[PDB]
């Protein structure tokens, strides 16, 4: 008990066609205000987590499981309440665009919430600005890069003021500068709004920066902890099939060269200073 916004409790889920559960007795919390990352391989139960947090997928035994978002228990009567609280940027940049233009696409959620139009104009302008899309305020998605359309998705998510933003493989199809753009922007949004980010990813750099990293293996929670705690455990992740971020790899290689560095070093800047201090 430490002020968690999301608490996944005893969730099992079998895709309807598939024979086996995609998630088995999975329980985890999300510390309010954190940026935690979910990572996993082949078992890819994380691909199921976002659509469960927000309600698109139900669990298997609603009597035994319970998801809770911002104090609201996810149920039949509260699905929409909860979706106001948990906003999701999704993987494919196109196919997330409803509107024929940027501004229309941001306006969609306000419309869904019956926001009086004079408010909407102000809101859509502010969001589209906050993502640096005012040059393309009236542009058609067929003329926008994937980096832009991920920004525009982010913007429409922003206009509804959610309590948690999930990036559900949101950088996975983007050019690396686009990955940094989208990551920086969601960091800026998180600071400027005191939000929580759930990142569902295979970008180990992305998860390297998370306050918390949960490891998912075959639909169960293999391990969980700060990146400085999780990513040094090279053997565990290698067996799951996961890699590790660049810094933890360079540290491990240096170890295979004989040079041993501590676990707490977890940063480009920290490491540079470490090797600096060794040469003097």
């Amino acid at each position, epitope marked *: 008990g430490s002020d968690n916004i999301i608490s996944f409790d005893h969730v099992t889920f079998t895709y309807p066609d598939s024979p086996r559960p995609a998630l088995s007795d999975l329980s985890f919390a999300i510390e309010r205000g954190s940026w935690t990352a979910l990572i996993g391989h082949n078992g890819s139960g994380k691909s199921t987590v976002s659509k469960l947090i927000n309600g698109l997928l139900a669990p298997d035994d609603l009597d035994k499981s319970s998801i809770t978002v911002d104090g609201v228990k996810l149920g039949a009567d509260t699905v929409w309440e909860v979706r106001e609280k948990v906003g999701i940027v999704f993987q494919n940049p196109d196919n997330q665009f409803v509107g024929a233009t940027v501004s229309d696409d941001v306006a969609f959620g306000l419309e869904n919430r019956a*926001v009086p139009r004079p408010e909407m104009l102000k809101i859509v302008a502010q969001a589209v600005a906050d993502v640096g899309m005012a040059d393309y305020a009236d542009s058609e998605p067929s003329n926008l890069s994937g980096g832009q359309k991920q920004r525009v998705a982010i913007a429409g998510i922003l206009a509804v003021k959610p309590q948690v933003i999930i990036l559900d493989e949101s950088t996975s199809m983007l050019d690396p500068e686009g990955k940094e753009q989208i990551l920086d922007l969601v960091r800026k949004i998180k600071e400027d*709004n005191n939000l929580t980010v759930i990142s569902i990813t295979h970008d180990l750099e992305e998860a390297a920066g998370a306050d918390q990293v949960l490891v998912l293996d075959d639909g169960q929670l293999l391990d969980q902890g700060k990146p400085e705690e999780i990513f040094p455990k090279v053997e565990m992740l290698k067996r799951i099939g996961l890699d590790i971020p660049f810094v933890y790899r360079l540290k491990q290689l240096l170890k295979e060269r004989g040079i041993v560095l501590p676990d707490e070093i977890d940063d480009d800047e920290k490491l540079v200073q470490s090797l600096w201090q060794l040469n003097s």
Partner: nanobody
Amino acid sequence: QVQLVESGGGLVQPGGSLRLSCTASGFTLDDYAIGWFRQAPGKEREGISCISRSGSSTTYADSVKGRFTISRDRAENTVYLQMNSLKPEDTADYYCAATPVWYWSCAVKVGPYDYWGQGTQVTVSS
């Protein structure tokens, strides 16, 4: 569209009760989720309660939970806050805030609300 007006604050004895009222004028409250907040003299502003544009969802802080009850009066374009079992600590300035971007829910946080009233002052002691 901000012209929010709190009312009904004043001095009341410990264990008594009183009902604050958050009214709009020039716009309709139903277009806005309404949150009640409360800033003590040396504290930070504290979200205490709130109601959704649907009017189906309500949130209370653990401080006021079970004593205060919020309500939308559609006919009267007001949202009422009903404070019972008032204790010395409840004494503060009370504010109502409005934001349109939620229909099905509401949150008790200072951040998301865009339009505020000027606050009515509630004092409980004897």
